[PDB]
Design a protein around this ligand. Structure first.
Ligand SMILES: Nc1ncnc2c1ncn2[C@@H]1O[C@H](COS(=O)(=O)NC(=O)[C@@H](N)CO)[C@@H](O)[C@H]1O
Length: 224
């Protein structure tokens, strides 16, 4: 029966687990509509993550620097969703939110030209405008490995083999037919990711090792 304490000290008593989105809705329609994620006992969580016990909660919106960072991170997922449609055999490596933007390192035999990047951004806009829900699922290490192995995503598989413990539960984020892996949080719906643009591309060695393949780093930025 969690007691949720908000930043101003107000408390909400519940007799069942509730997510940040559930609480936002209880507070009001405006806050629920603005809700991107939550901070529970100091840690960022997705808006759909259940809060089982008494906790301090803060609702994250686009007015928070954290909300902007989450929007940027989900735009990296959007880039993957789009690039996988334009060039299906593209392999996804790492795509983080960085200062002032985001990027995604990709393995594609085709060297992307300015026109290709423009085509990629165009598809991203079309997909984001569909306002689809981002579906999160926490799975076992092996379940995540099989998901990516079946998609031929060798870099994601390498990440599981070398950088994620067998006892950790990878977070999978589904964007329609596209799936990515992350600690998140990510936006609850792509309606929060309509304002972005792709910039330039650069070369980036996988794992920073010049003996490994030089991937194409696609930079972008987003705002809200
Ligand atoms: N439980 C976890 N679930 C998923 N990723 C995790 C987890 N713990 C640690 N990670 C690491 O966090 C990385 C996320 O990297 S990221 O650059 O922020 N994001 C991504 O590469 C993609 N989500 C695309 O945006 C994963 O590749 C993995 O190395």
């Amino acid at each position: 029966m969690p007691v949720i304490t908000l930043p101003d000290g107000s408390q909400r008593h519940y007799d069942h687990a509730v997510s940040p989105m559930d609480v936002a809705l209880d507070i009001g329609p405006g806050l629920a509509k603005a809700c991107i994620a939550g901070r529970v006992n100091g840690e960022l969580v997705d808006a759909c993550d259940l809060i089982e016990n008494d906790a301090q909660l803060s609702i994250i919106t686009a007015k928070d620097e954290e909300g902007l960072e989450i929007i940027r991170h989900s735009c990296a997922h959007l880039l993957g969703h789009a690039i996988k449609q334009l060039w299906p055999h593209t392999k996804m490596a790492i795509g983080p939110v960085i200062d002032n933007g985001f990027y995604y390192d990709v393995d594609l035999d085709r060297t992307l030209t300015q026109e290709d990047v423009e085509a990629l951004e165009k598809r991203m806009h079309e997909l984001a405008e569909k306002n689809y829900d981002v579906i999160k699922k926490k799975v076992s290490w092996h379940e995540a490995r099989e998901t990516f192995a079946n998609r031929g995503e060798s870099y994601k598989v390498s990440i599981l083999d070398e950088n994620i413990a067998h006892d950790d539960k990878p977070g999978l984020y589904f964007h329609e037919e596209y799936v990515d892996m992350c600690r998140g949080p990510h936006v609850p719906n792509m309606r929060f990711c309509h304002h972005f643009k792709l910039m330039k591309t650069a070369g980036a060695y996988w794992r920073g090792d010049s003996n490994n393949k030089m991937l194409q780093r696609i930079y972008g930025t987003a705002w809200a």
